Amino acid sequence: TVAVMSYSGYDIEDALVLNKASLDRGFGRCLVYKNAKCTLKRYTNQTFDK
Amino acid sequence: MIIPVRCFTCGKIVGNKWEAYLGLLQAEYTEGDALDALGLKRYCCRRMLLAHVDLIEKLLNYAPL
Amino acid sequence: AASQAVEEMRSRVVLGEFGVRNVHTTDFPGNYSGYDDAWDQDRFEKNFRVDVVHMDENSLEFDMVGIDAAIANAFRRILLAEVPTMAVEKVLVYNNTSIVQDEILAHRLGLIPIHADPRLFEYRNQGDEEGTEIDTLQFRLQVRCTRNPHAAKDSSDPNELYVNHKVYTRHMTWIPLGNQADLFPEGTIRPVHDDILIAQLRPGQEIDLLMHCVKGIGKDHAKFSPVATASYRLLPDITLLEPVEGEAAEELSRCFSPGVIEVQEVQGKKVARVANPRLDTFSREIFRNEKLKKVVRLARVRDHYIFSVESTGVLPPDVLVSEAIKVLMGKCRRFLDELDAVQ
Amino acid sequence: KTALEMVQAAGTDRHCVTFVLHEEDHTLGNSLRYMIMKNPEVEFCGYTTTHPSESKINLRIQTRGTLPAVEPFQRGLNELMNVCQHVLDKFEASIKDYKDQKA
Amino acid sequence: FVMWKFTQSRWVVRKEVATVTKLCAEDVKDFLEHMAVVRINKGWEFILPYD
Amino acid sequence: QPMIYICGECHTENEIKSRDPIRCRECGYRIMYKKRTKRLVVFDAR
Ligand SMILES: [Zn+2]
Ligand SMILES: [Zn+2]
């Protein structure tokens, strides 16, 4: 529910003001998933990373 | 993913009415009269319940189980 | 005349076609010559009054006459933020195999209200994560989804295929601490709605967790807000500049709300009149009809505020308002004590 | 440490005073502003917020004559407390009679 | 079962069909849309008239 | 120490030691996940 208006002058140039309670109730909640890969390969000699 | 418990704008408990809205949909009630009977006067809760997509079952279909 | 204009400016708030006028409170000493607007406790107590028009479970509506917009907004904001309640804060998980993320589950559980009476608890001091019997409540949630041993061959519906596949808030079990079992009777400490859908599971998944809830105000986080919608609006008072009759009466009835303008046949002809300006919401649809613009005068009463408070069910709205006023009085007393200690 | 006083300058003039109040918001600021504006012995009264990040407000009171500007503050606080008590009693009586006439 | 209900009565209730066949809402909706249309305050009606 | 894992399709608890061909019984799927820990984890509802 967006309201087009100026409030507190914190929306001067293309900025917007969010509601603390709305953000607390789950609005805009995002999840960032990253991957960390590791490899344990065998070399020419009969030895392996452990 | 799942219906939120609280509404973003106001904060009325709406997660408990998701199954009731689904039942009203399975019934002959339309979206408008269903949301009216559910007790949602202000349009914020109506939007919360209407614009919500049910993906929890789509994810459980892929869950390990 | 000038006196009528001053009276209107000081009493009513007129809403124009393009903008609202007379929106600032001016009833103060020195602003008016022919009016002694100095503070008078006697006149305030004489003119002030409260009338409840509707009061049901988790819903209240009451008109306050004599109060000012400043104190009205103060009460509203106190009810919205400065009323302490109980809400899940800490979540200890034990082998949660649910598809829902742990953080999202904790947030949903925190958003669940608690029917516990906050006046019987206190705020947790800085730190002390272990919690004490006075300022903590424990709710256990252990749900293990499994296949139904007895079901149809197809069982295309999950309701018949699996059991406990939807973890509702009714599965929460309040675990007493110390003498809380003796203090609070059985059935008091429980979820408010008892039907909030937390998550959905599948056979093999299990949700095991413990929720520690403490006392907190809505200003810190929205989960402590007891009131779902606590607002106030000025009383509308629609007045007709000239008697409107004929099909113009039905036009007025269709332009304004169906429950504010009523048509009557006093002499065989339909004439419109204001029945109950409470139901009117000032849709400003009368400005569309060119002829019916200069026949009505929409206005809001400055000293008449209808407060509507719909709560989430933690405690009734009358007690919510009482606690809000008590918190305001406590703030005033704290400031007075600080000033006395300073001087 | 909650409410602290400040003079207008190094001269320590009591006609103009600034009260800095911590852990507060617009609610009490506007309430006290409205309750003290009706005091005929106040030339100027104005509350402001330093920054939305920190929870503190600053009220400024300039009196007419030689008022210390602390007695008007105390008067406003007492009037606000009295109004709160009166509205609380009125609402309690209203709810009581409403329940009585409903039952 | 849906075709039998339609032959017995022109108006079929989606909720009754679902409760009887123990099937899911999406499958019932597909079965009903394959041979009928939605009518307000009356349920599901056969797409073609009585020939 | 018995190290346990879960299969990607059978979802059965399999115990394998170090330096073993990653496989699962009664199937041939080569995706093996690790079960969730048993330690106590604290979460904040904020
Ligand atoms: Zn809402
Ligand atoms: Zn396997």
From Swiss-Prot, chain A:
Source domain of life: Eukaryota
Residues where Mg(2+) binds: D14
Cellular compartments annotated: Nucleus; Cytoplasm, Cytosol
Protein role: Catalytic core component of RNA polymerase III (Pol III), a DNA-dependent RNA polymerase which synthesizes small non-coding RNAs using the four ribonucleoside triphosphates as substrates. Synthesizes 5S rRNA, snRNAs, tRNAs and miRNAs from at least 500 distinct genomic loci. Pol III-mediated transcription cycle proceeds through transcription initiation, transcription elongation and transcription termination stages. During transcription initiation, Pol III is recruited to DNA promoters type I, II or III with the help of general transcription factors and other specific initiation factors.
Family per similarity comment: Belongs to the RNA polymerase beta chain family.
Pathology noted in the entry: Leukodystrophy, hypomyelinating, 8, with or without oligodontia and/or hypogonadotropic hypogonadism: An autosomal recessive neurodegenerative disorder characterized by early childhood onset of cerebellar ataxia and mild intellectual disabilities associated with diffuse hypomyelination apparent on brain MRI. Variable features include oligodontia and/or hypogonadotropic hypogonadism.
Protein name (record): DNA-directed RNA polymerase III subunit RPC2
From Swiss-Prot, chain C:
GO biological process per UniProt: transcription by RNA polymerase I
N-acetylalanine sites (modified residues): A1
Subcellular location(s) of the protein: Nucleus; Nucleus, Nucleolus; Cytoplasm, Cytosol
Keyword Cytoplasm: yes
Chain positions found as Phosphoserine: S3
Predominant cellular place of this UniProt entry's protein: nucleus
Annotated consequence of substituting N31I: In HLD11; decreased localization to the nucleus and retained in the cytoplasm; loss of association with RNA polymerase III-transcribed genes; decreased association with RNA polymerase III complex; probably prevents RNA polymerase III complex assembly and activity
Statement: the UniProt record of this protein carries the keyword Acetylation: yes
Disease tied to this entry: Treacher Collins syndrome 3: A form of Treacher Collins syndrome, a disorder of craniofacial development. Treacher Collins syndrome is characterized by a combination of bilateral downward slanting of the palpebral fissures, colobomas of the lower eyelids with a paucity of eyelashes medial to the defect, hypoplasia of the facial bones, cleft palate, malformation of the external ears, atresia of the external auditory canals, and bilateral conductive hearing loss. Leukodystrophy, hypomyelinating, 11: An autosomal recessive neurologic disorder characterized by brain hypomyelination, delayed psychomotor development, intellectual disability, tremor and other neurologic symptoms. Some patients may additionally manifest non-neurologic features, particularly dental abnormalities and hypogonadotropic hypogonadism.
HAMAP family according to UniProt: RNApol_arch_Rpo3
Protein name: DNA-directed RNA polymerases I and III subunit RPAC1
From Swiss-Prot, chain E:
Name recorded for this polypeptide: DNA-directed RNA polymerase III subunit RPC5
Localization, UniProt: Nucleus
Domain of life the protein comes from: Eukaryota
Subunit structure: Component of the RNA polymerase III complex consisting of at least 17 subunits: a ten-subunit horseshoe-shaped catalytic core composed of POLR3A/RPC1, POLR3B/RPC2, POLR1C/RPAC1, POLR1D/RPAC2, POLR3K/RPC10, POLR2E/RPABC1, POLR2F/RPABC2, POLR2H/RPABC3, POLR2K/RPABC4 and POLR2L/RPABC5; the stalk composed of two subunits POLR3H/RPC8 and CRCP/RPC9, forming a structural mobile part that protrudes out of the core and functions primarily in transcription initiation; and additional subunits homologous to general transcription factors of the RNA polymerase II machinery, POLR3D/RPC4-POLR3E/RPC5 heterodimer and POLR3/CRPC3-POLR3F/RPC6-POLR3G/RPC7 heterotrimer.
From Swiss-Prot, chain F:
GO terms of molecular function: DNA binding; DNA-directed RNA polymerase activity; zinc ion binding
Keyword DNA-binding included in the entry's annotation: no
Biological process terms in GO annotation: regulation of transcription by RNA polymerase I; transcription by RNA polymerase II; transcription by RNA polymerase III
Annotated zinc fingers (C4-type), start-end: 7-27
Gene Ontology CC entries for this record: cytosol; nucleoplasm; nucleus; RNA polymerase I complex; RNA polymerase II, core complex; RNA polymerase III complex
Keyword Magnesium carried by entry: no
Major subcellular location class: nucleus
Cell compartment(s), UniProt: Nucleus; Nucleus, Nucleolus
Residues in the signal sequence: none
Keywords: DNA-directed RNA polymerase, Metal-binding, Nucleus, Transcription, Zinc, Zinc-finger
Binding site residues for Zn(2+): C7, C10, C24, C27
Its job: DNA-dependent RNA polymerase catalyzes the transcription of DNA into RNA using the four ribonucleoside triphosphates as substrates. Common component of RNA polymerases I, II and III which synthesize ribosomal RNA precursors, mRNA precursors and many functional non-coding RNAs, and a small RNAs, such as 5S rRNA and tRNAs, respectively.
Family the UniProt entry places it in: Belongs to the archaeal Rpo12/eukaryotic RPC10 RNA polymerase subunit family.
The protein's name: DNA-directed RNA polymerases I, II, and III subunit RPABC4
Organism: Homo sapiens
Gene assigned in the entry: POLR2K
Covered range of the whole protein: 13 to 58 of 58
